[PDB]
Design a protein around this ligand. Structure first.
Ligand SMILES: [Zn+2]
Lengths: 49, 1127, 49
C-alpha cells in the first residue's frame, strides 16, 4: 500500500455516487395510454405550495 | 449535598429577574409583562407589581406572600444594579493571574562536564588478532587507554550533552545514532502527520525540521561553565601540568578523553603518529584569577576536548548575562531613590567575591513587554479590575487617613431647623450621604485608577444621577447635584466637565433654556449620556450663546467650570538606572496627576484651607447659595427653609476635612512610592483639562502589517486594535470620603511612613519580573528570525538553508511552525503560562509591535520600539551557518543521487564517487525530463518510448535526469516500466533531491556483494508524500593485503559528502586497501600547528573538537543576602 | 448554506438563492440597538454570496 489517499477514495466515491443520480421524472399532468391525465386532483397552486 | 442546596437557594433568591436585553420596547414581543386587573402591559416585574399594588386600595392592605415577593424583587434589583457588584469576582482568571504574577524563567544554570556536542563512535571493529601482524604490536593487547577508539572505521556523530553534568535539565536534546542506523525519525517530526510509513519522511519539510533541530540544539547548549578543581600531575607523561577532575562515579575514564596529548607514543600506529605530531605544553590550566587567599579562583582557562561551536554559544550567552549584571551598590541607590528616603538599605564596602546578578535590561526590552501585556487586556474589564482592587487595599494600608461620617453628622447637628416644617435640609443630606451596600471603596479605587487612564476610564455610575431629570425645586434632588459636583473632578473620565454642566441644565428645565445642537441631545437628555468629545454642546464652548438675561445660573456655572476646575500636575517617581522605564506616551520617570501636587513642609500636619479641592467646594457652595437665593426657582418656600438651606451650605463649605490637604500633599507621594514596586507598570495618557481638541479618542495596538507596506509607521493607522474599558464608581462614596477625613492625633509623618513603607521593599519580586521581559523579547525575535527562513517577511536576514527542499508554506503552516517554536522555548527555560501566544492569533509572517493614541483633532501619536538583539536568534543563525559546511555530521547528504548499475572490483566509496561516471544537465547526450511526460508502449517488437521535455521520444536507456517529484507522483507506473531496465539494462537516472538523509551498509570487500535488494526496496517504497532514507553500500577498510571479489553497486551520490568519516584502520600502521583517512589534522589546530595562538577558531568550516575553554566560579545569591535593610 | 450557495451559483437560471426573511432585523430595528447593529453586520457580510 505505502500510501493512503489525501481526501479519501471511499468518501469521494460515496459523494460522487450520491451526486451521480439522474434527475427525478416529474410526471403529474401528462396522459396515460387510455388518455387520462395522471396525477392527484388538487389545485395547481396548492400543488406548488 | 449542601453545596447544591445552598446554590439552589441562592439562585431562587437572586434570579427573580428574566434578563437584561438591549432592544427597543414592544407591546407584543417587547417583554411586556401583562397584568390582568386591567389589560395594560408593563415592561418590568417590579413595574407590573407596582401596577397590581396600586390597584388594591392602599388603606386596606394586609400582609401577603405577594407583598413579600414584591419587596424581595425591589430589594434585589438594587443589589444587582450596584456597579461594584456588577464588576467583581473572587476567583482569578488565567489572564489576570498572568498579569499579576508570571512564571519567572530560569536562565542561570551551570555545567560541570566538558562542553561538547560531537562524539566519535566505532562503526566497525578492528582485527586485533590477524595473520600478518602479531598481537603484541597493538596497544589494545596491553590494555592501554587511548583517547580515540580503535576500530576499522570511526565516524563522528552528534549527541548534545553526552559528557555533561548539569544543574538544571533543559528538556530539548538532539540525539543521533551512528550512520549505520535509521535516523529518519529525527526529520519526520514536525509536519509529517499524514505520512504512513514508520521509515518515511516527506521531503518538502526537511527545511522546517532542520530549523527546529538547530533551534533545539542551541536551546540545549545554553549553560555556564563551572570551575571544579584541578590536580598536579604526579607522572612523567606531562610536564607537571594541572588536570581537571570532573564529578562523577566513573571519573577515571575522562583523563584519556579530555587530554589526547597525554598518552604515550610507543608505536607507529595512526593514533601514535598523531599524538607524536602534537605539541606538548597545551594541557590543563594555564591561567587563573585568584583575587583572594583561601577562596576559589574566579575563573580559569583550560585546554581540553570541546567543540568550537558550543564554546562560542556559551561564550555569547555569558556575554549577554554579563551585560545584564548589576552590583549591590547600584541596587542600594536604586532602592533608596525608589523609596524616596523613607527606607535605608545598606551595601557592604569591601573586596567582593564576584557575584552574578543579571537584573538590568534596556528600555526597548521593557516597552515591548508593556505593549504585549496591554494587548492582553483590551476591552475585558475583568482582567483590570483586580489590579485596581489590589492597589486600593495597598493604598488603604499605607495611608494615614481615616474616614468617619461622624464629622458630617456633628457639623450638620449645629444648624437650627424648625420642628414644624415639611423639609429638613440637614436631615436630607445625612440620609442620602450613606453609601449603598455600605462600601467606601470607590474612593481608593478611583484614586488608584489615576495610574491607568490609557486602558481604564473611571466614570461615575448612571445610578448616581437624579433619576430621570432633576429639578431645582426639589431639595433631595438638589443634594444630588451637590454630590455629583463634588465627586466628578476625581474621575479619569475625559468628558467629566460636560457633565456637572448638563446635570444642572437637566435640573433646571422650564426655568432656563439654552440652545442645544440637535433635536436628540436636547436639554432634557440625561446628563450621563454625554460621554464623547463629539457631544459637547456648542453653548459650552461659546458661552455667549448662554445669555446673562435668560440663563444667569447656567452662565455662571459654565464660567466657574472653565475657570476653577482643578489643574493637572506630576510627581516624578521611579529610578530608571537599574530598572528600565516602562511608560510609552510620557517621558521616562514621570507620573501624571489629575490634580495639583504641592509638597508639605512639616511632619506634624495641622489643618489648613488653601488648596484647589477646598476652593472647588467653596465655589460649588457659592453657586448653590445663588440658585437657592432668588424666588425665581423655588417660589413655594419659607424664609425659615431658605435660611436653613443657606446655613447648611455655608457650614458644609467650612467643614474641617483632612482629605483635600491629603490629596494635595501626601497622596501623590504614596503613589510614587507604590509605583516602582508594581507588577503592572503605569500606563498613562495626557490629562487634558477642558479642551475638546486634545481629548484622546482611542488607544490602539498593532501586531502585523496590512498588504505590502513593510514600514510600521504606514500600517499602524489601519491595522490596529482599540483597547480600553470604562469602570463605574459611586459618587456618594467618593463625596462622603471627600467630606469626612481625619488624621490620628499622634501623627508624625516621617515616623509613620518610615515603618509603613518598609515591609514592601523587603520582597524582591520586582527584580524577577525583569527576566520575564528578557525572555519575552528573546522569544519574539527568535520567532521573527525563524519564520523568515520558510516564508517571505519584510525583515533583512541571511538565508543559508536554501538548498534544502521546502514547501510553499501558507498561513496555517506558519502558525504550526510558530507553535512548535513556542513550545520548545517554553520547555527550555521551564515556564508553563503564556509566552508568544498573543502574537500567534494572527499570522506570524508579517509581525510588528507598535502602539498609538489619537486626539479629537485627528493628530495621532505613535510609539514604535526598536527591536533589540537576541543572543538566541544570533546563535541559531550561527548554527545554521555552520550546518551549511558540516551538514554531514547531522546525517544529511547534499546534492543528488545517480541510480545505475556499476559492477567492478574497485574500492572507491560511494560517498566519494569517481567523477567519470557522474553526469549533469551540461553533459552531451543527456535527456532532461520535466513536466509533460507520457509513455507509449512498443508494438510488434519495437522498444517503448518516453517523452523528453522537447517533445522527443527516447528508448529506455541512456543517461536521464528526473525531478524527484516526477517519480514521486508516478511511483508505481514507473517501477513496472523501468526497474527491469535499471537492473540489467543500460539505464541510468539522476534523481534530483537537493538534500536527503542516508544509511550505511558495510560489507567485506573480498566477497560477492549486490545492492539491488536495498535499491529496489528504496525505489519500491518511494511514495507521493514520503521517501525512505537513501541506502549506501560502503566497503570496509583493510589493514593488510586482501583479495578482490566482484561487487555490484547501484546508488551513488553526486558530490563528496563522506565528511563525517573520522579515521580508518586506527591502531594500525597504515591502510592498504579501501577508504583511507588519517586523523584530521585541520580539526586539531591548536595542537598540530605550533604557530597558531591558543585562542584561535576557524569556525564556519571546522569545529576543531579541541580548544581553550574558560570555566567560571561565580556566586548567584538572592538580593536579600547582599542588600540588607535597616528596620 | 455556504456550500448550497456555491452550488446554486451554477443554476442561476432555474433557482435563485435569497437570504432568509428571518435573518433581517426585527421590525427594521434601529441604530440605537446593539442587537440590530450586529444583525446588520452579519447580513451585510452574507448578502454578496
Ligand atoms: Zn392591569
Amino acid at each position: 500500500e505505502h500510501y493512503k489517499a489525501r481526501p479519501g477514495i471511499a468518501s469521494v466515491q460515496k459523494a460522487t455516487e450520491s451526486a451521480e443520480l439522474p434527475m427525478k421524472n416529474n410526471d403529474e399532468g401528462t396522459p396515460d395510454k387510455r388518455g387520462n391525465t395522471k396525477g392527484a386532483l388538487v389545485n395547481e397552486h396548492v400543488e406548488a405550495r | 449535598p449542601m453545596s447544591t442546596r445552598i446554590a439552589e437557594a441562592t439562585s431562587a433568591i437572586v434570579s427573580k429577574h428574566p434578563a437584561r436585553v438591549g432592544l427597543p420596547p414592544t407591546a407584543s414581543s417587547g417583554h411586556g409583562y401583562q397584568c390582568h386587573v386591567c389589560s395594560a402591559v408593563l415592561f418590568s416585574p417590579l413595574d407590573l407589581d407596582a401596577h397590581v399594588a396600586s390597584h388594591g386600595l392602599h388603606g386596606n392592605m394586609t400582609l401577603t406572600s405577594s407583598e413579600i415577593q414584591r419587596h424581595i424583587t425591589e430589594f434585589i434589583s438594587s443589589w444587582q444594579n450596584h456597579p461594584i457588584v456588577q464588576v467583581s469576582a473572587d476567583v482569578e482568571n488565567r489572564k489576570t493571574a498572568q498579569l499579576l504574577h508570571a512564571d519567572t524563567p530560569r536562565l542561570v544554570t551551570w555545567d560541570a562536564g566538558l562542553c561538547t556536542s560531537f562524539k566519535i563512535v566505532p562503526i566497525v571493529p578492528a582485527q586485533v588478532p590477524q595473520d600478518v601482524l602479531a598481537y603484541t604490536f597493538f596497544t589494545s593487547s596491553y590494555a592501554i587507554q587511548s583517547p580515540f577508539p580503535e576500530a576499522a572505521v570511526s565516524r563522528i556523530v552528534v549527541h548534545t550533552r553526552w559528557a555533561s553534568n548539569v544543574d538544571f535539565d533543559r528538556d530539548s536534546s538532539v540525539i543521533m545514532a551512528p550512520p549505520t542506523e535509521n535516523n529518519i525519525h529525527l526529520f519526520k517530526q514536525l509536519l509529517n502527520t499524514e505520512t504512513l510509513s514508520v521509515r518515511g519522511a516527506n521531503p518538502l519539510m526537511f527545511r522546517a525540521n532542520v530549523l527546529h533541530m538547530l533551534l533545539e540544539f542551541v536551546l540545549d547548549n545554553l549553560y555556564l561553565n563551572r570551575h571544579t578543581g584541578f590536580s598536579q600531575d604526579h607522572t612523567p607523561f606531562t610536564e607537571g601540568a594541572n588536570l581537571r577532575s570532573l564529578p562523577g562515579p566513573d571519573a577515571e575514564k575522562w583523563y584519556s578523553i579530555m587530554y589526547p596529548t597525554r598518552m604515550g607514543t610507543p608505536n607507529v600506529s595512526k593514533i601514535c603518529n598523531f599524538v607524536a605530531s602534537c605539541v606538548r605544553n597545551r594541557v590543563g590550566r594555564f591561567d587563573r584569577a585568584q583575587m583572594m587567599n583561601g577562596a576559589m579562583s574566579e575563573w580559569v582557562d583550560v585546554f581540553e576536548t570541546s567543540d568550537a561551536l558550543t564554546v562560542s554559544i556559551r561564550g555569547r550567552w555569558m556575554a549577554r548575562l554579563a551585560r545584564m549584571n548589576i552590583n549591590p551598590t547600584e541596587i542600594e541607590w536604586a532602592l533608596t531613590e525608589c523609596a524616596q528616603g523613607y527606607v535605608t538599605v545598606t551595601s557592604p564596602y569591601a573586596p567582593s567575591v564576584n557575584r552574578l546578578m543579571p537584573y538590568r535590561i534596556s528600555n526597548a526590552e521593557r516597552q515591548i513587554s508593556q505593549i504585549i501585556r496591554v494587548m492582553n487586556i483590551g476591552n475585558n474589564a475583568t482582567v483590570i479590575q483586580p489590579v485596581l482592587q489590589d492597589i486600593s487595599v495597598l493604598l488603604q494600608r499605607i495611608s494615614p487617613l481615616q474616614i468617619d461620617p461622624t464629622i458630617i453628622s456633628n457639623t450638620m447637628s449645629t444648624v437650627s431647623e424648625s420642628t414644624t416644617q415639611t423639609l429638613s435640609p440637614a436631615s436630607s443630606i445625612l440620609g442620602k450621604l450613606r453609601p449603598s451596600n455600605s462600601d467606601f471603596s470607590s474612593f481608593r479605587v478611583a484614586l488608584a485608577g489615576w495610574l491607568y487612564n490609557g486602558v481604564v476610564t473611571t466614570v461615575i455610575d448612571d445610578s448616581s444621577y437624579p433619576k430621570d431629570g432633576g429639578s431645582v425645586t426639589s431639595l433631595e434632588n438638589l443634594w444630588d447635584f451637590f454630590i455629583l459636583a463634588l465627586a466628578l473632578p476625581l474621575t479619569t473620565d475625559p468628558c467629566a466637565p460636560v457633565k456637572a454642566f448638563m446635570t444642572l441644565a437637566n435640573m433646571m428645565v422650564g426655568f432656563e433654556t439654552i440652545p442645544m445642537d440637535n433635536q436628540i441631545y436636547t436639554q432634557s437628555r440625561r446628563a450621563s449620556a454625554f460621554s464623547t468629545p463629539h457631544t459637547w454642546p456648542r453653548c459650552f464652548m461659546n458661552i455667549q450663546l448662554i445669555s446673562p438675561i435668560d440663563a444667569p445660573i447656567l452662565r455662571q456655572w459654565a464660567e466657574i467650570i472653565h475657570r476653577y476646575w482643578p489643574n493637572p500636575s506630576q510627581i516624578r517617581y521611579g529610578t530608571p538606572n537599574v530598572f528600565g522605564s516602562a511608560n510609552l506616551f510620557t517621558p521616562p520617570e514621570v507620573l501624571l496627576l489629575p490634580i495639583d501636587h504641592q509638597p508639605a513642609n512639616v511632619t506634624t500636619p495641622t489643618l489648613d484651607f488653601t488648596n484647589e479641592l477646598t476652593n472647588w467646594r467653596a465655589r460649588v457652595c457659592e453657586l448653590m447659595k445663588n440658585l437657592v437665593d432668588n424666588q425665581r426657582y423655588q417660589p413655594g418656600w419659607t424664609q425659615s427653609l431658605v435660611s436653613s438651606m443657606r446655613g447648611t451650605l455655608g457650614k458644609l463649605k467650612l467643614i474641617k476635612s483632612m482629605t483635600p490637604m491629603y490629596l494635595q500633599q501626601l497622596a501623590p507621594v504614596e503613589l510614587a512610592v507604590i509605583a516602582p514596586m508594581l507588577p503592572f507598570p503605569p500606563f498613562q495618557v495626557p490629562y487634558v483639562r477642558l479642551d475638546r481638541d486634545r481629548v484622546p479618542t482611542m488607544v490602539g495596538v498593532t501586531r502585523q502589517s496590512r498588504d505590502t507596506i513593510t514600514q510600521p509607521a504606514l500600517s499602524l493607522s489601519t491595522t490596529n486594535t482599540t483597547v480600553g474599558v470604562p469602570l463605574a464608581l459611586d459618587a456618594r462614596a467618593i463625596t462622603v470620603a471627600l467630606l469626612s477625613g481625619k488624621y490620628p492625633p499622634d501623627l508624625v509623618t516621617n515616623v509613620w511612613y518610615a515603618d509603613a513603607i518598609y515591609p514592601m521593599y523587603a520582597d524582591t519580586e520586582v527584580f524577577s519580573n525583569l527576566q520575564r521581559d528578557v525572555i519575552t523579547c528573546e522569544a519574539v525575535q527568535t520567532l521573527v528570525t525563524l519564520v523568515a527562513q520558510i516564508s517571505e517577511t519584510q525583515y533583512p536576514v541571511d538565508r543559508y538553508l536554501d538548498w534544502i527542499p521546502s514547501l510553499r508554506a501558507s498561513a496555517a503552516t506558519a502558525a504550526t511552525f510558530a507553535e512548535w517554536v513556542n513550545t520548545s522555548m517554553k520547555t527550555a527555560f521551564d515556564l508553563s503560562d503564556m509566552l508568544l501566544e498573543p502574537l500567534l492569533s494572527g499570522d506570524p509572517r508579517m509581525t510588528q509591535l507598535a502602539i498609538q493614541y489619537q486626539q479629537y483633532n485627528g493628530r495621532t501619536f505613535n510609539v514604535i520600539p526598536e527591536m533589540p538583539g537576541s543572543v538566541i536568534a544570533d546563535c541559531v543563525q550561527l548554527t545554521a551557518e555552520v550546518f551549511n559546511h558540516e551538514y554531514n555530521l547531522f546525517g544529511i547528504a547534499r546534492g543528488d543521487i545517480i541510480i545505475g548499475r556499476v559492477q567492478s572490483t574497485h574500492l572507491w566509496s560511494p560517498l566519494a564517487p569517481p567523477p567519470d561516471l557522474v553526469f549533469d544537465r551540461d553533459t552531451p547526450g543527456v535527456h532532461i525530463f520535466g513536466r509533460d511526460c507520457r509513455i507509449s508502449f512498443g508494438m510488434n517488437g519495437a522498444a517503448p518510448m518516453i517523452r523528453d521535455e522537447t517533445g522527443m521520444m527516447v528508448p529506455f536507456e541512456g543517461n536521464w535526469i528526473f525531478p524527484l517529484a516526477l517519480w514521486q507522483m508516478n511511483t508505481r507506473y514507473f517501477n513496472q516500466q523501468f526497474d527491469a531496465w535499471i537492473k540489467t539494462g543500460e539505464l541510468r537516472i539522476r534523481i534530483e533531491m537537493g538534500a536527503y538523509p542516508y544509511m550505511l551498509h558495510y560489507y567485506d570487500p573480498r566477497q560477492y556483494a549486490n545492492a539491488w535488494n536495498l535499491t529496489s526496496a528504496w525505489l519500491e517504497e518511494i511514495t507521493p508524500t514520503s521517501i525512505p532514507s537513501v541506502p549506501f553500500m560502503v566497503p570496509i577498510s583493510s589493514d593488510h593485503d586482501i583479495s578482490s571479489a566482484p561487487a555490484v553497486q547501484y546508488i551513488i551520490s553526486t558530490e563528496y559528502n563522506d565528511r563525517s568519516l573520522f579515521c580508518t584502520n586506527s591502531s594500525s600502521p597504515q591502510t592498504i586497501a579501501g577508504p583511507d583517512k588519517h586523523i584530521p589534522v585541520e580539526r586539531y589546530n591548536i595542537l598540530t600547528n605550533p604557530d597558531a595562538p591558543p585562542t584561535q577558531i576557524q569556525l564556519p568550516e571546522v569545529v576543531d573538537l579541541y580548544n581553550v575553554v574558560t570555566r567560571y566560579a561565580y556566586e548567584t545569591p538572592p538580593i536579600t543576602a547582599v542588600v540588607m535593610g535597616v528596620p
